[PDB]
Design an enzyme around this catalytic site. Structure first.
Site, mmCIF file in Angstrom:
data_model
loop_
_atom_site.group_PDB
_atom_site.id
_atom_site.type_symbol
_atom_site.label_atom_id
_atom_site.label_comp_id
_atom_site.label_asym_id
_atom_site.label_seq_id
_atom_site.Cartn_x
_atom_site.Cartn_y
_atom_site.Cartn_z
ATOM 1 N N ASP A 191 1.089 -1.133 0.242
ATOM 2 C CA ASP A 191 -0.211 -0.234 -0.032
ATOM 3 C C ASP A 191 1.037 1.001 0.159
ATOM 4 O O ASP A 191 0.611 2.310 0.600
ATOM 5 C CB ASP A 191 -1.087 0.159 1.000
ATOM 6 C CG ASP A 191 -1.949 0.513 1.062
ATOM 7 O OD1 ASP A 191 -2.013 1.635 -0.437
ATOM 8 O OD2 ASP A 191 -2.173 1.522 2.571
ATOM 9 N N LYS A 200 2.730 5.067 -1.227
ATOM 10 C CA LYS A 200 2.412 5.751 -1.975
ATOM 11 C C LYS A 200 2.206 6.948 -1.527
ATOM 12 O O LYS A 200 2.986 6.701 -0.356
ATOM 13 C CB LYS A 200 0.576 5.565 -1.912
ATOM 14 C CG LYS A 200 0.079 5.778 -0.758
ATOM 15 C CD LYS A 200 -1.390 5.282 -0.726
ATOM 16 C CE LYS A 200 -2.073 5.032 1.206
ATOM 17 N NZ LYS A 200 -3.363 5.486 0.617
ATOM 18 N N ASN A 230 2.387 7.404 2.133
ATOM 19 C CA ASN A 230 3.275 7.246 3.056
ATOM 20 C C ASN A 230 4.456 7.538 2.996
ATOM 21 O O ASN A 230 5.138 7.112 4.112
ATOM 22 C CB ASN A 230 2.748 5.725 3.014
ATOM 23 C CG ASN A 230 1.408 5.377 2.984
ATOM 24 O OD1 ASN A 230 0.602 4.707 3.787
ATOM 25 N ND2 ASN A 230 0.758 4.016 1.569
ATOM 26 N N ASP A 282 3.456 3.877 7.570
ATOM 27 C CA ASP A 282 1.488 3.217 7.684
ATOM 28 C C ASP A 282 1.810 1.449 7.492
ATOM 29 O O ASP A 282 2.113 1.056 6.112
ATOM 30 C CB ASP A 282 1.129 3.566 6.513
ATOM 31 C CG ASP A 282 -0.092 2.922 6.806
ATOM 32 O OD1 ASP A 282 -0.952 2.239 7.591
ATOM 33 O OD2 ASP A 282 -1.389 4.196 6.069
ATOM 34 N N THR A 319 -4.674 1.478 -2.794
ATOM 35 C CA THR A 319 -5.259 2.206 -2.966
ATOM 36 C C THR A 319 -4.975 2.149 -4.187
ATOM 37 O O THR A 319 -3.814 1.630 -4.870
ATOM 38 C CB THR A 319 -4.513 4.077 -2.847
ATOM 39 O OG1 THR A 319 -4.102 4.547 -1.743
ATOM 40 C CG2 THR A 319 -5.002 5.371 -3.423
HETATM 41 C C1 LIG Z 1 3.790 17.297 10.240
HETATM 42 O O1 LIG Z 1 3.434 16.339 9.703
HETATM 43 C C2 LIG Z 1 3.045 15.343 9.559
HETATM 44 C C3 LIG Z 1 3.736 13.812 10.488
HETATM 45 C C4 LIG Z 1 3.965 12.830 10.798
HETATM 46 N N1 LIG Z 1 4.873 11.978 10.588
HETATM 47 C C5 LIG Z 1 5.150 10.780 11.576
HETATM 48 C C6 LIG Z 1 3.701 10.136 11.311
HETATM 49 C C7 LIG Z 1 4.322 8.351 11.301
HETATM 50 N N2 LIG Z 1 4.672 8.385 11.906
HETATM 51 N N3 LIG Z 1 2.486 8.087 11.081
HETATM 52 C C8 LIG Z 1 1.319 8.706 10.592
HETATM 53 C C9 LIG Z 1 0.479 7.125 10.138
HETATM 54 C C10 LIG Z 1 0.819 5.450 10.723
HETATM 55 C C11 LIG Z 1 -1.133 7.782 9.498
HETATM 56 N N4 LIG Z 1 -1.785 7.245 9.153
HETATM 57 C C12 LIG Z 1 -0.913 9.258 9.449
HETATM 58 C C13 LIG Z 1 0.027 10.311 9.811
HETATM 59 C C14 LIG Z 1 1.767 9.539 10.338
HETATM 60 C C15 LIG Z 1 2.751 10.662 10.416
HETATM 61 C C16 LIG Z 1 2.225 12.245 9.864
HETATM 62 C C17 LIG Z 1 1.675 12.994 9.274
HETATM 63 C C18 LIG Z 1 1.782 14.445 9.109
HETATM 64 O O2 LIG Z 1 0.808 14.699 8.460
HETATM 65 C C19 LIG Z 1 0.448 14.205 7.527
#
Ligand SMILES: COc1cc2ncc3c(N)nc4c(C)c(N)ccc4c3c2cc1OC
Length: 275
Positions: A131, A133, A136, A149, A161
């Site tokens: 997955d 993309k 991720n 992810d 996706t």
């Molecule tokens: C400062 O911007 C970010 C920083 C971000 N930093 C780390 C992560 C992370 N380890 N895992 C994630 C997972 C597993 C998601 N399902 C969604 C967002 C993150 C995420 C993350 C997202 C962010 O914004 C889009």
């Protein structure tokens, strides 16, 4: 030595999934920032996802590479599960592709290399992301990638996706390492063209183009990059540059498009400026 919710000053929602919510959290005694993935046990159970959550934690726990998110810890209270994750400062790769529209050859070259390198590591451990993309692929403070992810990872079903779905997944309900390589082909295309290769009015229509290999290259598209993309976006999953039937990552990293790349220490070079 187990941490608790009170040990953190929670902030902003960083991501909101279907069985999950990622919140930015600052550890009080260290001042460190983590991406804390929160999950409600009832919901997970009520949804028959225990196997999925379990597999996600295990896979992440077995990760020890700079181009990958790190699981720093885990704890739970009566209602929720918390996964202490690696905080990627500069957000999604997708964010940048849209901001500057398209990547020039040098940026495309550098960031694509980091993804191959990341994958070479992942597949070496017998793990399939399935997955993959731009959403991720995160960017840390230094602008180096951080793939995250793993709620859909497998360890040598599902479907990621639409735009990045592998043909064999639509034909045989199959999914192998080479399946992550198809996604890679799509992402490179998207980095250079600015859009994913297969786009349509609805999912059903996207899948149709995929299995028919319906897509075109812009005239602008970097030649050596076009040549690489063509050797990844092959319907036959046994003939994609990188899969084991093609003798792995050796050939793939030798591809003319990566001529200029020093694979030995990508993680320590300073990223080309995104313009
Ligand atoms: C400062 O911007 C970010 C920083 C971000 N930093 C780390 C992560 C992370 N380890 N895992 C994630 C997972 C597993 C998601 N399902 C969604 C967002 C993150 C995420 C993350 C997202 C962010 O914004 C889009």
């Amino acid at each position: 030595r187990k941490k608790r919710p009170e040990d953190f000053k929670f902030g902003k929602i960083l991501g909101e999934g279907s069985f999950s919510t990622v919140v930015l959290a600052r550890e009080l005694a260290t001042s460190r920032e983590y991406a804390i993935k929160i999950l409600e046990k009832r919901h997970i159970i009520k949804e028959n996802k225990v196997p999925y959550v379990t597999r996600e934690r295990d896979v992440m726990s077995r990760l020890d590479h700079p181009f990958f998110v790190k699981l720093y810890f885990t704890f739970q209270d009566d209602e929720k599960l918390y996964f202490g994750l690696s905080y990627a400062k500069n957000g999604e790769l997708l964010k940048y592709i849209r901001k500057i529209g398209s990547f020039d050859e040098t940026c495309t070259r550098f960031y694509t290399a980091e993804i191959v390198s990341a994958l070479e590591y992942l597949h070496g451990k017998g793990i399939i992301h399935r997955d993959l993309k731009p959403e991720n692929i995160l960017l840390n403070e230094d602008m180096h990638i951080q793939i995250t992810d793993f709620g859909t990872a497998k360890v040598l079903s599902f479907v990621g996706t639409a735009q990045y779905v592998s043909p064999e997944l639509l034909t045989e309900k199959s999914a192998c390492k080479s399946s992550d390589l198809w996604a890679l082909g799509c992402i490179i295309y998207q980095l250079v063209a600015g859009l994913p290769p297969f786009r349509a009015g609805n999912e059903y229509l996207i899948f149709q183009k995929i299995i028919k290999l319906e897509y075109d290259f812009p005239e602008k598209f970097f030649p050596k990059a076009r040549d690489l993309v063509e050797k990844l976006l092959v319907l036959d999953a046994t003939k994609r540059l990188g899969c084991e039937e093609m003798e792995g990552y050796g050939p793939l990293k030798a591809h003319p498009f990566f001529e200029s790349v020093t694979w030995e220490n990508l993680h320590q070079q300073t990223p080309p400026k995104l313009t």
